[PDB]
Amino acid sequence: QLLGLLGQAATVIGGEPTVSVEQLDFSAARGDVALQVRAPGFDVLERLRSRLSESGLAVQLGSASRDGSTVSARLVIG
Amino acid sequence: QLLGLLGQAATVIGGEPTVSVEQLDFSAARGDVALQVRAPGFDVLERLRSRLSESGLAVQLGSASRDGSTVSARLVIG
């Protein structure tokens, strides 16, 4: 079902213009979608996780850290 | 400017239910989306390429080979 999931996540992440997707990958073997994202701050990552989850997606937000103007984290979408 | 790219590709690929996405990776450094797909036959991969291109996506279909019941190839979008 990692086809509606992709499209839905992409639409939700597009509703957060300050979020950038640096890398993204899925494998059938692993079973989920992993995204490396950057955002101006942690509140934006939390909101994005909230929006993905609200849309019905299983989402995990990895540990975030700040470097300069942005924070970065790994998102896992079921 | 590729969240819609991925979202659009997911919709087009979803219109080909016999195609399976085994792996998918994107990288901003690379600048495109690579997909490892399988399908029952080459005609399905060619139809999928045609549909992605028809939808307005830049698409390249790598060399395909058969193993057992399926063929496999690499798709590059963007």
Numbering used by the authors:
A (entry chain A), B (entry chain B): 304 to 381
Task: Give excerpts from the publication.
In our studies we have focused on the periplasmic segment of GspL (historically called XcpY) from P. aeruginosa, GspLperi, which consists of two domains: a membrane proximal domain (MPD) connected via a short linker to a ferredoxin-like domain (FLD). The inner-membrane bitopic protein GspL can be considered a central player in the T2SS because it appears to interact extensively with other components of the system. Even though the exact mode of secretion via T2SS has not been fully elucidated, the role of GspL is anticipated to help in linking adenosine triphosphate (ATP) hydrolysis to the assembly of the pseudopilus, which together constitute the two crucial steps in exoprotein transport. In this work we presented two distinct crystal structures of GspLfld, which in combination with the crystal structure of GspLfld from Vibrio parahaemolyticus, provide direct evidence for the conservation of a hydrophobic dimer interface.
In contrast to the dimer of GspLfld in crystal form 1 and the dimer of GspLfld from V. parahaemolyticus, crystal form 2 displays a full dimer in the crystal asymmetric unit. The distance between the main chain atoms of β1 and β1′ of crystal form 1 is in the range of 4.5–5.0 Å and is drastically greater than the equivalent interdomain in crystal form 2, which are instead within hydrogen bonding distances (2.8–3.0 Å). In this regard, crystal form 2 and the V. parahaemolyticus crystal form of GspLfld appear as closed versions of the dimer whereas crystal form 1 exploits a novel conformation, resulting in an open variant of the interface.
